[PDB]
Paper text:
On the other hand, ST0587-CS exhibits 51% sequence identity with CS from hyperthermophilic archaeon Pyrococcus furiosus (PF-CS). ST0587-CS crystallized into an orthorhombic crystal belonging to P41212 that diffracted X-rays up to 2.7 Å resolution. In this crystal form, the asymmetric unit contains one monomer. This citrate synthase also forms a dimeric structure, the 2-fold axis of which coincides with the crystallographic 2-fold axis. The final model is comprised of 373 amino acid residues and 40 water molecules. As observed for ST1807-CS, each subunit is subdivided into a large domain with 11 α-helices (C-G, I-M, and S helices, residues 1–212 and 321–373) and a small domain with five α-helices (N-R helices, residues 213–320). The N-terminal region is folded into three strands (residues 18–21, 26–29, and 32-33), forming an antiparallel β-sheet, whereas an intersubunit β-sheet found in ST1805-CS is absent in ST0587-CS. In the structure of ST0587-CS, six putative substrate-binding residues (His180, His215, His254, Arg263, Arg335, and Arg354′) were also structurally conserved. The numbers of ion pairs composed of residues of opposite charge situated within 4.0 Å were 36 and 55 in each dimer of ST1805-CS and ST0587-CS, respectively. In ST0587-CS, an ion pair network was organized by four residues, Asp93 and Arg96 in G helix, Lys211 in MN loop, and Asp198′ in L′M′ loop of neighboring subunit, and continued into hydrophobic center of the helix bundle.
Citrate synthase (CS, EC 2.3.3.1), an enzyme involved in the TCA cycle, catalyzes the condensation of oxaloacetate and acetyl-coenzyme-A (CoA) to form citrate and CoA. Thermoacidophilic archaeon [name] strain 7, which grows optimally at 75°C and pH 3, has two genes encoding two distinct isozymes of hypothetic CS. One of them encoded by an open reading frame (ORF) ST1805 is termed ST1805-CS, and the other, encoded by the ORF ST0587, is termed ST0587-CS. We confirmed these two isozymes to function in high temperatures as CS and determined the crystal structures of them at resolutions of 2.0 Å and 2.7 Å, respectively.
Residue numbers in the entry:
A (entry chain A), B (entry chain A): 1 to 373
Write the structure that this text describes.
C-alpha cells in the first residue's frame, strides 16, 4: 500500500563490485581504493578487477588485454552507418544505435557473457573516436592493436600517438568512471538483463538512460561556466551572484558524497597538469576553476557540498581534444565496464525485475457510443 | 536492510491506465471492459482511450487517426537500413535498431511527447511489415494512408487489402495487447523515461526488455506444440505424458490470472473463425488446440491454471500470414501504445528511478603488485 516511486531507498541487489562511503569520501572497486588504482593500476587491469572480482596475475591480465585489442574493430555495416549518418546527430544516439547494430552483426550465441562483454567494451572507443573524426570531416583512423586501451583511444582521435601525460590522464579518467553508485542507467541495464535479453540489448538500455538530462553526473555544464566567467578576476561576482538568487554551482554537490569527491581530488592533478602544459585559453579556464573551487568550498563547503568529478572532468575531456557533446559518450566508454560487471553479478541468481503498479482509477464504466459522447 | 531483488511486490507507480483482476478474470482499459472494447471499439479508438484516459468524440478521434496515418512513412535512411541489413536478423533487433534510428532522424524537439508518441506508434507496423517482405525477398510495399491502422498492417504484409474478418481479427488482436500488468519491459521504458531521455530511447529499452526470453507472455511455443502433436487423436498421450514428468503446457497458466484469460476468451473466437475459413493444415492445428484446451482445463483447471492469450494468439498470428519469429514484434506494435501511455502518466510527477544496492564485500584491501600475485 506504499508506492515507492523513484525507488529511492529500495535495495534491488547485493553487490561486491563498488563501495562508496559518502560520509568519509571513500571509494573502492572490489575493496581496492580508487586512489591506489588511479596511482598504481590502469584501465585494463581495473576492468579485469571489476569484471572478475580480483586483481589478475600476469597470465590472466595478458589474456585479458589480448581479448581487448583483438576485438576493437567495427564491422563494415556499422562503419558504413557512421560515415553515412546525419552528422549533427547526438554522439549518445550514435553510440546507442551502433551498439544495437553490433548486436545484429553478432551471431555467436555460444559465447560466455563476459567474453561478449570484453568485445563490446573494446569497441566503444572505436565508435566514439570514429564518429568524432567523420563528424569533423576527417577519416576513420583504425585501431592500432599494438597500443593499450587508453592510448589507442586518443590515437584514433588525433591520428597520432598521444604524449604520455595525455594517455595517463585519459587512462586515469576512464578508471574513475568505470563504476559508481546504483543509478538509473546501471539499473536500466539490469532490468533488461534480468529478462535474459542479449548483452547488446542491456547496454543499449544503459546508454539510453545515461544520456537522460535528469541523470546524476555527466553534466559538463562546468566547462560552460568557466567559459562565461571571462577572467578569473570576474569569478567571485559571478559565483556570489549565482548563490544570492539560489542557483546551483556546476560541478559542486553530490547525492552521496558529503565531502570532496575522491575522483575529483584525483582528477584535479591531471586537469592542472594538462592545462598548464597547454598554456592557452585552456590554462586560463583552469585558473578560473581554481578560483571557483576556492570560493565555492568557502561558501558551500560548510553545507557539505564540494566539487565533484564533473568539475574537473570537463576541463580534462576538453584538453584531451574532445568536444563537449562527446563527453557523455566517453563517460559511457568507461561505465559500460561497470554495466557488464553488474549484469554478470546480477544473473548468477537471476530474478526478472517486474515491479507492481497501484491502480487508483475506476472500473465498470459503460461503453458509450461515439455520437452520444 | 531487506534486499527486494526482483521488485516483486514493490509498487513503482500509481496508475489509471490498466486494471487486472486476476481473481475474477477481469481486464479494464481506463475503466472500460476489454470485452466491450474488443466488441465495440478499434485499435485507433482504444489507443486514444489509453493515451488520454477517455473515449474520444468524433472530432478528437478524427484528429487522432489523422496523425496516425500521416506519419506511417519511414525515412529513407532506415528503409535503407532494412533492405541492406542481414536478413537472418531477429525481427526484434530490427525493431530495436530502427526505432533507435528513428530517434536520430527526428529533429523536432519542441514536440509534445504524445505527438511524438503517435508517430512512433504508427511506424512500428511499417517497420515490421517492410522487414518481413524484404526478408522473404519481396519488396517494400508502402503504407496506404487511406486505410485504417490494422487493415494497413495486413495490407503492407500481403501487398493486397485483407478480407474483413482478417483485419477485424488483426484489430482485436492488437487491442488485446496494447497494455497489461506492470512488467520488465514497461518498467525498462519507465526507468529510461524517468531520466527524461528522449521517447525513442525509452521505447528502445522497452523492446530490449520485451524480447528477453524470461519475459512473461510473448511465448508462441504453443504453435510449436500444436505442430508436434500430429493429429488431434495424439493430443491426450502427448499432454498426459508432459504432465506426468512435470513439464509445462504452453499457453497455459498466468502470473496474475487464476482464471481463463479474458483476452484468450475473446481471441479464441477469431482463432476458430480464421482457422475454419482457411481449412488447411491450420484448421487441423486449431482442432489440436481445442483438444488440448479440453484436457488441459480438465487436469490443470482445478489448480487455477487455464489457457492464456498466447494459447490462441499464435494460431492467429500464423493464420494472418506472419512467421513465428515476427510474433513478438507484432506484440510490440500493440504494446508500444501502452509504453507511451505509462511514460506520459509517469512523468506528470516525474521521479528519476535510482534504486540502491547493498554492498556485502570487503574494503581496505592492500594493492598487491602484479609479480607478488
Amino acid at each position: 500500500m506504499e508506492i515507492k516511486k523513484g525507488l529511492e531507498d529500495v535495495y534491488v541487489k547485493e553487490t561486491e563490485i563498488t563501495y562508496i562511503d559518502g560520509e568519509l569520501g571513500r571509494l573502492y572497486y572490489r575493496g581496492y581504493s580508487i586512489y591506489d588504482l588511479a596511482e598504481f593500476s590502469n584501465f585494463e587491469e581495473v576492468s579485469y578487477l571489476i569484471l572478475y572480482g580480483k586483481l589478475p596475475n600476469r597470465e590472466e591480465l595478458n589474456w585479458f588485454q589480448e581479448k581487448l585489442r583483438e576485438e576493437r574493430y567495427l564491422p563494415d555495416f556499422i562503419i558504413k552507418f557512421l560515415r553515412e549518418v546525419r552528422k549533427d546527430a547526438q554522439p549518445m544516439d550514435i553510440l546507442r544505435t551502433a551498439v544495437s547494430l553490433l548486436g545484429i552483426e553478432d551471431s555467436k550465441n555460444d559465447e560466455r557473457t563476459d567474453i561478449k562483454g570484453i568485445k563490446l567494451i573494446s569497441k566503444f572507443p572505436t565508435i566514439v573516436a570514429n564518429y568524432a573524426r567523420l563528424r569533423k570531416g576527417l577519416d576513420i583512423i583504425e585501431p592500432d592493436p599494438k597500443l593499450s586501451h587508453s592510448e589507442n583511444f586518443l590515437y584514433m582521435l588525433y591520428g597520432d600517438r598521444p604524449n604520455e601525460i595525455k594517455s595517463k590522464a585519459m587512462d586515469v579518467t576512464l578508471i574513475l568512471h568505470i563504476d559508481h553508485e546504483m543509478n538509473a542507467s546501471t539499473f536500466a541495464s539490469l532490468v533488461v538483463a534480468s529478462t535474459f535479453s542479449d548483452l547488446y540489448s542491456s547496454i543499449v538500455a544503459g546508454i539510453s538512460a545515461l544520456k537522460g538530462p535528469l541523470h546524476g553526473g555527466a553534466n559538463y555544464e562546468a566547462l560552460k561556466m568557466f567559459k562565461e566567467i571571462g577572467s578569473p578576476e570576474k569569478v567571485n561576482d559571478y559565483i556570489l551572484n549565482r548563490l544570492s538568487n539560489k542557483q546551483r554551482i556546476m560541478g559542486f554537490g553530490h547525492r552521496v558524497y558529503k565531502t570532496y569527491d575522491p575522483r575529483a581530488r584525483i582528477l584535479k592533478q591531471y586537469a592542472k597538469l594538462l592545462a598548464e602544459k597547454e598554456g592557452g585559453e585552456i590554462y586560463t579556464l583552469y585558473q578560473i576553476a581554481e578560483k571557483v573551487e576556492e570560493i565555492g568550498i568557502k561558501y558551500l563547503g560548510p553545507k557539505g557540498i564540494y566539487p565533484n568529478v564533473d568539475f574537473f572532468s570537463s576541463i580534462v575531456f576538453y584538453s584531451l581534444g574532445f568536444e563537449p557533446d562527446f563527453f557523455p559518450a566517453v563517460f559511457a566508454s568507461a561505465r559500460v565496464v561497470g554495466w557488464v560487471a553488474h549484469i554478470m553479478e546480477y544473473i548468477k541468481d537471476n530474478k526478472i525485475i517486474r515491479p507492481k503498479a497501484y491502480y487508483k482509477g475506476e472500473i465498470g464504466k459503460k461503453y458509450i457510443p461515439i455520437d452520444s459522447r
